[PDB]
Amino acid sequence: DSMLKTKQSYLKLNSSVENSLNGFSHLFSKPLMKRVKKLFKNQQEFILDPQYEADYVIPVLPGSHLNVKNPLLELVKSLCHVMLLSKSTILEIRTLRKELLKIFELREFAKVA
Amino acid sequence: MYYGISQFSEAYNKILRNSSSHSSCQLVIFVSCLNIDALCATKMLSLLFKKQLVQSQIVPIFGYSELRRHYSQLDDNINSLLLVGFGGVIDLEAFLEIDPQEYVIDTDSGEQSFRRDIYVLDAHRPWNLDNIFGSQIIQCFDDGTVDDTLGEQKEAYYKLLELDRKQRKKQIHEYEGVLEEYYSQGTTVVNSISAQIYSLLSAIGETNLSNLWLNILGTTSLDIAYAQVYNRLYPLLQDEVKRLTPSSRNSVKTPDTLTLNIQPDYYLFLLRHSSLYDSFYYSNYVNAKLSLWNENGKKRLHKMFARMGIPLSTAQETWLYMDHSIKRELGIIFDKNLDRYGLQDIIRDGFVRTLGYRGSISASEFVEALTALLEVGNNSAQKLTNLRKRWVSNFWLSWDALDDRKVELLNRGIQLAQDLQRAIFNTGVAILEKKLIKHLRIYRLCVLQDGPDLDLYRNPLTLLRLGNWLIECCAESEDKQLLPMVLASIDENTDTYLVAGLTPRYPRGLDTIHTKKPILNNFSMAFQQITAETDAKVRIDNFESSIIEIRREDLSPFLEKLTLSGLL
């Protein structure tokens, strides 16, 4: 939805190196960071306590070949990857990924990240 | 009480009757490695049983899991078990799955006999009341605390034991409260096992200069973290040295004379085996009193040396080759120019042993060499066992260092001690410069995440050495209030931490009313309670209760729950 809104705004203003999407992350960057902080605190509270392991469990699928230690980190990795798919907005998404990884105290270029 | 001071000879005679058979080896001594006091106590026992030709086996055990595994492997023929340095704070019959009905023979006639006797021998004060009071197989070598300071606990335990209306229930809760307040107490140390076994030897009459030296080593092993215990036990050693030294004093030195002496032994670091400058620089106490970790400390040290009139070239010279003019005036110079810097506590009296022509050595230096030999002498659940194997192996290096014929090993231990103190100093200045110690209102956390030589700190002894360095530094800072400290060190190969909850202590040489009351390490109960719930792959097996191995990812939630835990 944020990408659609940014494309509509660019089309309205006017009517790859740089396309219609250049600030779509700015729409949801702060809510995403706050949500990730809240989820990290919730995980730190409930990661070890039982009755919650039914939720913090990595599913087993035929293609599964990765050992996951921080499922929230896997979620943010997937979100950052699907955001990094775009070639035009590489830099503004790398900054967002760095800010997200600062929550986990992980370096931007860490192998696990 | 189970075995008082006056009836150690009874335990020794019972051991002799039960297992002094030349046919086989029915005596097994379980010794806790990474404990100099237990090492000296087991050396005493080895010599004593060598005199009486009692066949015995000495097993170094690192953790409670190894103890349980060995006991499961233990044959039923062995009818005498010695646990040195551990076992006094846990339900050993429950831990080892012991039921007295399967170990009892000839029940009749008001007497009972058992087919195996376990003699626990340690100094940690939280005696398990089911061991000191409610078990006949487990026999505890008490030091007089239970017969004098556990009357109320004795009554509370016995009333609950015998009793299995409103007044009865109220009184049971009152008594059970007495038992509960006895628990929830930090684990301290009141005595030295070496002194206890030397008392037993005095009862038997086997005391000699070698046994006295082992006693001095075991006692001096306690001077760094339990200085009140060392000061309590020092007069006894001082009297024994006078008693045992031959009357032929002031005689000429011969290649055979062994001399225990009480002479000024300054509280420096390996003074006789390193330069004077390096003795001050790497001393824990001098560092605390001068803050040598920062840049200005080295300038203060140089200024002190200039003030005493000792040139830096002479100060940095090896102690053997220091000019006899300066070396013979150390007492006067230290008297004149030490109270200025607050290092008056450096001057001290210690025990120095010279073996013929081999040069002097003090007990303080000897225990540092032994500790160094213990520490660095030589997917996740397997490499850790390899570390345990190496740690057990180092016990025998430290054991062989005691023999007078292996001085070439004691010198290697001295070199390793200097290297380890250098590494500890480097890591300490790295921690205090980056301000890694996060001050809290419960405990000053400090986690080692990256750096050089971080593989040294997976050993509990080296981690405790670094912790003692930090605690000595913090204790002399008036602004910093007393607070427990936590050290962790990530093991990259096993992806596991080594959390070592420490305890604060008052400045050395400061004797007050609150100083008299010892500080109790509350981390054991906190760790066990946190691990009982919220399964986190914690490995609580060390005889040192306040040390655990925790997964890299589970460390932060563990510390969060510990912050939420008000036990400590």
XYZ file of C-alpha atoms in Angstrom:
681
model
C 0.000 0.000 0.000
C 2.853 2.405 0.754
C 4.416 1.659 -2.634
C 1.067 2.268 -4.328
C 0.612 5.582 -2.509
C 4.111 6.743 -3.449
C 3.580 5.793 -7.098
C 0.265 7.660 -7.150
C 1.897 10.734 -5.611
C 4.717 10.655 -8.166
C 2.248 10.310 -11.042
C 0.142 13.197 -9.727
C 3.218 15.403 -9.320
C 4.570 14.629 -12.796
C 1.197 14.799 -14.562
C 16.550 1.867 -12.654
C 18.491 4.849 -11.317
C 15.326 6.511 -9.983
C 11.690 5.484 -10.428
C 8.392 6.637 -8.937
C 9.324 4.968 -5.631
C 11.893 7.010 -3.722
C 10.454 7.561 -0.241
C 7.957 4.757 0.245
C 9.901 3.639 3.322
C 9.319 7.004 5.009
C 5.602 6.210 5.248
C 6.062 3.182 7.521
C 9.662 3.395 8.767
C 8.863 4.703 12.254
C 5.829 2.437 12.891
C 7.883 -0.540 11.719
C 10.778 0.330 14.026
C 8.454 0.799 17.005
C 6.637 -2.457 16.237
C 9.947 -4.298 15.973
C 11.088 -2.879 19.318
C 7.823 -3.968 20.945
C 8.080 -7.425 19.380
C 11.682 -7.760 20.554
C 10.732 -6.872 24.128
C 7.810 -9.309 23.990
C 10.110 -12.040 22.680
C 12.747 -11.376 25.347
C 9.957 -11.742 27.901
C 8.432 -14.915 26.446
C 11.264 -16.622 24.536
C 12.279 -18.939 27.394
C 9.030 -19.180 29.350
C 6.984 -22.292 28.452
C 3.393 -22.178 27.117
C 4.822 -19.840 24.451
C 7.119 -22.314 22.671
C 4.135 -23.292 20.518
C 4.531 -19.838 18.922
C 8.329 -19.418 18.869
C 8.893 -22.619 16.871
C 10.470 -22.814 13.416
C 8.236 -24.789 11.025
C 9.670 -27.838 9.284
C 9.191 -27.741 5.508
C 10.677 -29.860 2.704
C 13.066 -27.074 1.746
C 14.152 -26.293 5.304
C 17.941 -26.151 5.537
C 18.572 -23.162 7.839
C 19.039 -23.141 11.608
C 17.155 -20.197 13.120
C 18.151 -18.831 16.522
C 16.118 -15.581 16.524
C 12.780 -15.958 14.691
C 12.105 -12.220 14.951
C 15.469 -11.647 13.281
C 14.349 -13.985 10.504
C 11.144 -11.959 10.119
C 13.003 -8.658 9.866
C 15.507 -10.249 7.476
C 12.678 -11.338 5.183
C 11.010 -7.918 5.336
C 14.280 -6.122 4.637
C 14.998 -8.469 1.724
C 11.626 -7.964 0.055
C 12.156 -4.233 0.533
C 15.702 -4.443 -0.907
C 14.313 -6.094 -4.043
C 13.812 -2.618 -5.532
C 16.922 -1.280 -7.261
C 16.049 2.421 -7.024
C 15.495 2.541 -3.242
C 18.525 0.488 -2.207
C 20.063 3.173 0.012
C 16.948 4.226 1.927
C 16.163 0.575 2.646
C 19.734 -0.206 3.721
C 19.459 2.630 6.241
C 16.187 1.163 7.520
C 17.776 -2.286 7.743
C 20.705 -0.851 9.700
C 18.312 0.836 12.125
C 16.350 -2.405 12.507
C 19.510 -4.420 13.148
C 20.643 -1.913 15.774
C 17.743 -3.242 17.867
C 19.266 -6.731 17.852
C 22.722 -5.196 18.454
C 23.779 -6.768 15.152
C 26.172 -5.146 12.710
C 24.786 -4.113 9.336
C 27.064 -6.476 7.385
C 27.057 -9.339 9.893
C 26.929 -12.811 8.375
C 23.907 -13.829 10.460
C 22.023 -10.724 9.316
C 27.600 -31.448 64.411
C 28.797 -34.667 62.803
C 32.599 -34.745 63.306
C 33.980 -32.022 65.549
C 37.569 -30.891 65.819
C 38.317 -33.163 68.777
C 37.116 -36.330 67.016
C 38.881 -36.200 63.651
C 41.095 -39.037 64.894
C 37.938 -41.135 65.203
C 37.223 -40.602 61.504
C 40.819 -41.416 60.581
C 40.749 -44.618 62.640
C 37.408 -45.568 61.092
C 38.922 -45.095 57.633
C 41.933 -47.200 58.627
C 39.753 -50.008 59.970
C 37.472 -49.979 56.936
C 39.982 -49.708 54.095
C 43.611 -50.204 55.208
C 43.861 -53.574 53.456
C 46.918 -54.257 51.310
C 44.886 -56.785 49.303
C 43.045 -54.169 47.227
C 42.385 -50.423 46.917
C 39.119 -49.750 48.753
C 39.671 -46.009 49.316
C 38.835 -43.378 46.697
C 39.497 -39.661 47.187
C 37.393 -37.325 45.057
C 39.170 -33.975 44.749
C 37.701 -30.837 43.202
C 40.140 -29.438 40.669
C 40.449 -25.665 40.272
C 40.857 -25.328 44.039
C 44.308 -24.846 45.555
C 43.004 -25.552 49.054
C 41.579 -28.903 47.968
C 44.813 -29.643 46.103
C 46.914 -29.091 49.228
C 44.457 -31.051 51.374
C 44.584 -33.989 48.968
C 48.380 -33.809 48.914
C 48.334 -34.028 52.714
C 46.002 -37.021 52.553
C 48.168 -38.672 49.897
C 51.290 -38.313 52.032
C 49.496 -39.518 55.166
C 48.109 -42.593 53.417
C 51.514 -43.237 51.860
C 53.008 -43.359 55.355
C 50.445 -45.969 56.452
C 50.501 -47.846 53.108
C 46.765 -47.361 52.584
C 46.049 -47.943 48.905
C 43.944 -45.102 47.530
C 42.743 -43.564 44.277
C 42.679 -39.808 43.656
C 40.195 -38.589 41.044
C 40.035 -34.896 40.034
C 36.390 -33.967 39.467
C 35.461 -30.673 37.836
C 31.663 -30.591 38.121
C 28.706 -32.242 39.809
C 27.846 -34.144 36.628
C 31.287 -35.768 36.691
C 30.797 -36.623 40.367
C 27.469 -38.307 39.631
C 28.879 -40.189 36.638
C 31.884 -41.436 38.613
C 29.720 -42.512 41.550
C 27.484 -44.423 39.142
C 30.650 -46.004 37.741
C 31.971 -46.559 41.277
C 32.229 -50.214 42.243
C 30.603 -51.564 45.397
C 33.914 -52.877 46.765
C 35.123 -49.338 47.527
C 33.938 -48.846 51.116
C 35.420 -45.404 51.824
C 34.839 -42.227 49.820
C 36.452 -38.836 50.427
C 34.943 -35.722 48.843
C 37.470 -32.892 49.143
C 36.354 -29.341 48.447
C 32.675 -29.947 47.679
C 29.537 -31.858 48.585
C 28.709 -29.959 51.759
C 25.963 -27.742 50.330
C 23.813 -30.240 48.394
C 21.658 -33.255 49.252
C 24.347 -35.796 48.456
C 22.200 -38.842 49.228
C 19.493 -37.390 46.992
C 21.974 -36.147 44.385
C 23.763 -39.507 44.181
C 20.530 -41.528 44.574
C 21.565 -43.052 47.902
C 19.161 -45.031 50.081
C 20.610 -46.209 53.422
C 18.703 -49.505 53.344
C 20.824 -50.690 50.402
C 24.116 -49.720 52.088
C 23.463 -51.012 55.629
C 24.997 -54.210 57.021
C 24.730 -55.623 60.557
C 21.957 -53.354 61.805
C 22.074 -55.130 65.187
C 21.771 -53.343 69.974
C 21.599 -49.580 69.525
C 24.099 -49.205 66.692
C 24.264 -49.157 62.906
C 26.988 -49.905 60.363
C 27.100 -49.231 56.633
C 28.963 -50.850 53.754
C 30.225 -47.525 52.365
C 31.200 -44.290 54.104
C 31.313 -40.920 52.342
C 33.397 -38.279 54.121
C 32.673 -34.808 52.763
C 35.487 -32.332 53.370
C 34.905 -28.707 52.371
C 34.610 -25.229 53.850
C 31.451 -23.748 52.299
C 29.187 -22.875 55.238
C 25.658 -23.578 53.941
C 25.817 -27.097 55.348
C 22.906 -29.110 54.022
C 20.943 -30.050 57.126
C 19.968 -33.368 55.556
C 23.720 -34.117 55.418
C 25.001 -32.712 58.712
C 21.968 -33.951 60.670
C 19.825 -36.439 58.776
C 22.163 -38.994 57.230
C 24.569 -41.577 58.631
C 26.338 -42.541 55.394
C 27.372 -38.935 54.730
C 29.945 -37.874 57.326
C 30.933 -34.205 57.432
C 34.257 -32.941 58.793
C 32.853 -29.960 60.644
C 35.093 -27.161 61.919
C 33.016 -26.300 64.993
C 30.366 -24.102 63.383
C 27.518 -26.613 63.579
C 27.966 -27.471 67.256
C 27.891 -23.769 68.185
C 25.841 -21.873 65.577
C 23.267 -24.479 64.480
C 21.413 -25.279 67.697
C 18.218 -23.585 66.530
C 18.452 -25.243 63.120
C 19.101 -28.594 64.810
C 15.954 -28.256 66.919
C 13.902 -27.079 63.936
C 15.089 -29.973 61.772
C 14.510 -32.623 64.440
C 11.032 -31.378 65.374
C 9.918 -31.479 61.738
C 11.546 -34.890 61.276
C 9.793 -36.453 64.271
C 6.407 -34.764 63.798
C 6.108 -35.820 60.122
C -4.278 -28.906 65.865
C -3.921 -25.149 65.386
C -1.009 -24.889 67.828
C 0.819 -27.796 66.179
C 0.450 -26.309 62.691
C 1.501 -22.854 63.906
C 4.595 -24.250 65.621
C 5.496 -26.277 62.522
C 5.403 -23.125 60.398
C 7.487 -21.324 63.024
C 10.075 -24.115 62.940
C 9.919 -24.373 59.149
C 10.598 -20.644 59.059
C 13.802 -21.273 61.009
C 14.888 -23.827 58.409
C 13.942 -21.487 55.567
C 15.866 -18.516 56.955
C 18.848 -20.849 57.333
C 18.603 -21.423 53.591
C 18.401 -18.419 51.241
C 21.879 -17.549 52.527
C 24.922 -16.786 50.421
C 27.709 -19.338 50.239
C 30.793 -18.210 52.160
C 33.993 -19.879 53.364
C 35.024 -19.856 57.019
C 37.988 -22.260 57.207
C 40.645 -23.836 55.019
C 40.575 -27.563 54.305
C 44.360 -27.657 54.625
C 44.121 -26.326 58.177
C 41.443 -28.901 59.014
C 43.567 -31.796 57.760
C 46.583 -30.360 59.566
C 44.506 -30.360 62.749
C 43.718 -34.016 62.071
C 47.431 -34.705 61.564
C 48.233 -32.927 64.824
C 45.720 -35.240 66.480
C 47.419 -38.266 64.902
C 50.926 -36.883 65.402
C 52.209 -37.018 61.818
C 53.026 -33.301 61.584
C 56.297 -32.317 59.922
C 57.753 -29.433 57.942
C 56.343 -30.587 54.594
C 52.837 -30.926 56.029
C 53.167 -27.516 57.669
C 54.223 -26.041 54.324
C 51.202 -27.566 52.600
C 49.028 -26.112 55.365
C 50.565 -22.685 54.803
C 49.940 -22.950 51.059
C 46.323 -23.974 51.562
C 45.704 -21.146 54.013
C 47.459 -18.537 51.861
C 45.232 -19.585 48.973
C 42.421 -17.837 50.896
C 44.108 -14.459 51.389
C 42.882 -12.913 48.136
C 39.107 -13.298 48.538
C 38.615 -14.247 52.221
C 41.245 -12.175 54.003
C 39.301 -12.426 57.263
C 39.735 -16.217 57.206
C 43.459 -15.890 56.513
C 43.862 -13.369 59.332
C 41.926 -15.695 61.637
C 44.121 -18.698 60.804
C 47.458 -16.854 60.656
C 48.356 -17.039 64.395
C 48.035 -20.835 64.366
C 50.489 -21.114 61.468
C 52.792 -18.629 63.185
C 52.812 -20.775 66.328
C 53.348 -23.991 64.356
C 56.346 -22.545 62.510
C 57.986 -21.645 65.821
C 57.170 -25.084 67.227
C 58.611 -27.077 64.324
C 61.730 -25.050 63.471
C 64.842 -26.698 64.957
C 66.686 -24.963 67.775
C 69.954 -24.898 65.782
C 69.324 -21.360 64.576
C 71.902 -18.961 63.069
C 73.757 -21.993 61.697
C 75.637 -21.986 58.406
C 73.579 -22.701 55.299
C 74.026 -26.222 53.928
C 72.648 -27.758 50.718
C 70.122 -29.745 52.787
C 68.565 -27.207 55.174
C 64.877 -26.434 54.676
C 63.863 -23.288 56.557
C 60.343 -22.048 57.154
C 60.684 -18.417 58.183
C 58.311 -15.620 59.132
C 59.878 -12.555 57.516
C 58.510 -9.385 55.886
C 56.630 -10.583 52.796
C 55.336 -7.478 51.045
C 51.949 -7.851 49.378
C 53.322 -7.432 45.854
C 53.065 -9.750 42.851
C 55.920 -12.263 42.499
C 58.405 -9.880 44.065
C 61.283 -12.359 44.237
C 60.787 -13.744 40.715
C 60.335 -10.457 38.841
C 61.493 -6.867 38.896
C 60.449 -4.503 41.664
C 58.739 -2.257 39.117
C 56.755 -5.190 37.741
C 55.846 -6.266 41.276
C 54.252 -2.896 42.016
C 52.802 -2.472 38.531
C 50.945 -5.792 38.364
C 49.893 -5.943 42.015
C 46.137 -5.945 42.545
C 46.345 -3.820 45.692
C 48.739 -1.252 44.226
C 46.570 -0.982 41.124
C 43.501 -0.392 43.281
C 45.262 2.200 45.441
C 46.848 4.055 42.501
C 44.550 3.315 39.525
C 47.409 2.295 37.254
C 44.905 1.300 34.559
C 44.601 4.909 33.414
C 47.481 6.876 31.921
C 48.233 8.911 35.055
C 48.860 5.783 37.129
C 52.165 4.969 35.451
C 53.319 8.527 36.117
C 52.329 8.105 39.769
C 54.340 4.878 39.939
C 57.431 6.475 38.408
C 57.080 9.417 40.791
C 56.875 7.017 43.743
C 60.006 5.184 42.629
C 61.867 8.471 42.220
C 60.661 9.549 45.663
C 62.108 6.429 47.280
C 65.411 7.114 45.540
C 65.351 3.844 43.587
C 66.467 4.433 39.975
C 64.189 3.045 37.293
C 67.094 0.987 35.954
C 67.548 -0.598 39.383
C 63.785 -0.838 39.892
C 63.313 -2.755 36.637
C 66.238 -5.087 37.371
C 65.463 -8.702 38.224
C 65.225 -9.199 41.972
C 68.163 -11.613 42.161
C 70.542 -9.177 40.476
C 69.300 -6.009 42.180
C 72.198 -4.304 43.923
C 72.605 -5.537 47.481
C 72.571 -1.934 48.717
C 68.982 -1.332 47.612
C 67.769 -4.877 48.272
C 68.897 -4.715 51.907
C 67.171 -1.352 52.499
C 63.708 -2.287 51.227
C 62.195 -2.279 54.708
C 63.515 1.162 55.636
C 62.656 2.660 52.244
C 59.138 1.228 52.363
C 58.692 2.550 55.903
C 59.719 6.051 54.835
C 57.890 6.309 51.511
C 54.736 4.214 51.498
C 52.269 5.942 53.827
C 52.449 8.933 51.475
C 50.686 6.967 48.726
C 48.416 5.009 51.063
C 50.275 1.741 50.418
C 51.069 1.145 54.095
C 49.192 -2.167 53.847
C 51.801 -3.403 51.351
C 54.168 -4.153 54.236
C 53.167 -7.505 55.698
C 54.474 -10.657 57.366
C 54.493 -13.929 55.448
C 56.146 -17.331 55.267
C 59.292 -17.813 53.178
C 60.825 -21.233 52.510
C 64.403 -21.709 51.309
C 65.565 -25.168 50.250
C 69.329 -25.185 50.647
C 70.878 -23.133 47.850
C 67.796 -22.802 45.637
C 66.785 -19.318 46.750
C 63.850 -18.042 48.764
C 60.183 -18.304 47.848
C 57.109 -17.164 49.746
C 53.759 -18.899 50.066
C 52.072 -16.006 48.252
C 54.293 -16.569 45.218
C 53.966 -20.343 45.441
C 50.168 -20.283 45.325
C 50.248 -17.914 42.340
C 52.499 -20.389 40.537
C 50.163 -23.258 41.443
C 47.131 -21.288 40.251
C 48.854 -20.467 36.966
C 49.639 -24.139 36.427
C 45.996 -24.987 37.093
C 44.791 -22.363 34.608
C 47.145 -22.627 31.624
C 49.206 -25.709 32.414
C 48.684 -27.406 29.057
C 29.453 -29.689 18.371
C 28.845 -27.839 21.648
C 28.555 -30.642 24.220
C 31.802 -32.301 23.054
C 34.381 -29.500 22.852
C 33.293 -28.421 26.332
C 34.100 -31.932 27.560
C 37.518 -31.539 25.928
C 37.973 -28.369 27.974
C 36.988 -30.284 31.111
C 39.531 -32.966 30.210
C 42.324 -30.402 29.842
C 41.236 -28.736 33.095
C 41.418 -32.066 34.919
C 44.839 -32.703 33.382
C 46.167 -29.374 34.687
C 45.404 -30.554 38.229
C 48.232 -33.071 37.970
C 50.666 -30.420 36.747
C 49.811 -28.327 39.790
C 50.101 -31.461 41.944
C 53.568 -32.324 40.629
C 54.633 -28.713 41.180
C 54.426 -29.332 44.938
C 57.249 -31.885 44.863
C 60.653 -30.422 45.699
C 62.246 -32.411 42.861
C 60.208 -30.615 40.179
C 61.368 -27.015 40.593
C 61.718 -26.822 36.811
C 57.917 -27.078 36.780
C 57.422 -24.468 39.502
C 59.506 -22.018 37.467
C 57.274 -22.666 34.459
C 54.329 -21.988 36.744
C 55.893 -18.678 37.778
C 56.357 -17.679 34.139
C 52.746 -18.602 33.376
C 51.600 -16.567 36.383
C 53.409 -13.500 35.082
C 51.907 -13.966 31.611
C 48.391 -14.426 32.997
C 48.660 -11.366 35.218
C 49.806 -9.387 32.184
C 46.802 -10.605 30.186
C 44.463 -9.838 33.092
C 45.873 -6.321 33.354
C 45.431 -5.746 29.623
C 41.820 -6.927 29.670
C 41.135 -4.878 32.793
C 42.397 -1.665 31.241
C 40.376 -2.537 28.137
C 37.211 -2.975 30.228
C 37.701 0.128 32.379
C 38.553 2.356 29.405
C 35.533 1.437 27.279
C 33.402 1.554 30.465
C 32.080 -1.938 29.805
C 30.782 -2.365 33.365
C 27.146 -1.264 33.191
C 26.197 0.132 36.588
C 22.803 -1.000 37.871
C 20.808 -0.781 41.090
C 21.085 -4.561 41.625
C 24.379 -5.732 40.120
C 27.119 -4.169 37.993
C 26.996 -6.282 34.847
C 29.999 -6.695 32.552
C 29.982 -8.894 29.438
C 33.085 -9.650 27.375
C 31.868 -9.851 23.774
C 35.072 -9.410 21.761
C 38.765 -8.722 22.125
C 42.142 -10.433 22.352
C 42.969 -13.680 24.165
C 39.295 -14.149 25.023
C 39.867 -17.919 25.135
C 41.678 -17.496 28.460
C 38.441 -16.666 30.266
C 36.539 -19.864 29.558
C 38.531 -21.261 32.484
C 36.672 -20.433 35.725
C 39.924 -19.735 37.564
C 41.100 -17.108 35.069
C 37.656 -15.505 35.032
C 37.737 -15.362 38.832
C 41.217 -13.833 38.631
C 39.933 -11.069 36.357
C 36.907 -10.621 38.594
C 39.136 -10.276 41.644
C 41.158 -7.656 39.770
C 38.000 -5.675 38.979
C 36.580 -6.091 42.492
C 39.814 -4.936 44.099
C 39.795 -1.912 41.797
C 36.172 -1.095 42.660
C 36.559 -1.710 46.398
C 39.043 1.141 46.839
C 36.727 3.629 45.083
C 34.704 5.388 47.778
C 32.083 6.695 45.342
C 31.205 3.212 44.076
C 28.912 1.556 46.603
C 29.241 -2.159 47.273
C 27.301 -4.221 44.743
C 27.653 -7.723 43.266
C 29.339 -7.928 39.876
C 28.706 -10.289 36.961
C 31.314 -11.326 34.395
C 30.580 -13.184 31.176
C 32.857 -14.400 28.399
C 31.584 -15.733 25.081
C 33.096 -19.023 23.916
C 32.975 -18.787 20.128
C 33.550 -22.498 19.509
C 30.642 -23.596 21.716
C 28.575 -20.397 21.245
C 28.109 -20.315 25.021
C 28.812 -17.763 27.724
C 30.387 -18.258 31.157
C 28.489 -16.133 33.671
C 30.388 -15.791 36.960
C 28.395 -13.928 39.589
C 30.910 -12.464 42.017
C 30.683 -10.764 45.412
C 31.950 -7.377 46.601
C 34.408 -6.955 49.435
C 35.612 -4.168 51.683
C 38.997 -2.497 51.128
C 41.919 -4.591 52.316
C 43.256 -3.593 55.716
C 40.026 -1.779 56.648
C 38.701 -3.340 59.866
C 35.286 -2.120 61.047
C 32.122 -3.582 62.551
C 30.477 -4.121 59.158
C 33.770 -5.522 57.856
C 33.606 -8.219 60.546
C 30.333 -9.516 59.113
C 31.288 -11.417 55.934
C 29.695 -10.741 52.565
C 27.627 -13.637 51.235
C 27.462 -14.613 47.556
C 23.752 -14.911 46.743
C 24.121 -15.806 43.055
C 23.806 -19.584 43.497
C 20.169 -19.576 44.608
C 19.269 -16.930 42.027
C 20.822 -18.959 39.206
C 19.153 -22.185 40.338
C 15.748 -20.519 40.700
C 15.994 -18.858 37.284
C 17.063 -22.144 35.680
C 14.338 -24.222 37.364
C 11.729 -22.301 35.380
C 12.129 -20.937 31.845
C 14.347 -23.664 30.399
C 17.370 -21.903 28.918
C 20.017 -24.642 28.420
C 21.848 -23.497 31.556
C 24.598 -25.806 32.837
C 24.789 -25.510 36.633
C 27.373 -28.147 37.523
C 30.351 -26.262 38.983
C 31.315 -26.809 42.599
C 31.771 -23.061 42.557
C 28.035 -22.484 42.740
C 27.997 -18.964 41.268
C 29.260 -19.965 37.806
C 27.093 -21.126 34.896
C 27.413 -21.739 31.169
C 24.586 -20.152 29.175
C 23.813 -20.093 25.461
C 24.763 -16.996 23.495
C 21.172 -16.167 22.543
C 19.714 -17.016 25.968
C 22.086 -14.745 27.906
C 20.062 -11.536 27.588
C 16.680 -12.994 28.683
C 18.489 -14.758 31.526
C 19.928 -11.455 32.729
C 16.510 -9.826 32.333
C 14.890 -12.450 34.560
C 17.786 -12.122 37.008
C 17.144 -8.376 37.190
C 13.499 -9.190 37.879
C 14.721 -11.662 40.522
C 15.039 -10.046 43.942
C 16.751 -13.035 45.563
C 20.240 -11.514 45.468
